[PDB]
């Protein structure tokens, strides 16, 4: 067996071809930049 799915068909593991190396993979990163502001009437500084 060379690569490995999770419960829903996304390959989260792989073996190096030239070597043995069971590498499990993980997705890059992401989220939602949400911007915290006091309101442009008070000020113009934001936390992220």
């Amino acid at each position: 067996q060379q690569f490995g799915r999770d419960i829903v068909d996304t390959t989260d593991a792989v073996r190096d071809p030239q070597t043995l190396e069971i590498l499990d993979i993980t997705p890059c990163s992401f989220g939602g930049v949400s911007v915290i502001t006091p309101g442009t009437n008070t000020s113009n500084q934001v936390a992220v």
Binding site: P27, C28, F30, G31, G32
Partner: protein, 49 residues
């Protein structure tokens, strides 16, 4: 017509009641789901309004 029944003892009974209050708050990355993280596909997607 003329007979009544009246308790003579009592009973303290504790019963429970389970109620759902909140559910899991998800968020979706509309592009990264639809178009896959890294694709000019996304450049096609913005066409869809």
């Amino acid at each position: 017509n003329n007979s009544i029944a009246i308790p003579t003892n009592f009973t303290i009974s504790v019963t429970t009641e389970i109620l759902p209050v909140s559910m899991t708050k998800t968020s979706v990355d509309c592009t990264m789901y639809i178009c896959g993280d890294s694709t000019e596909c996304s450049n096609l997607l913005l066409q869809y309004g």
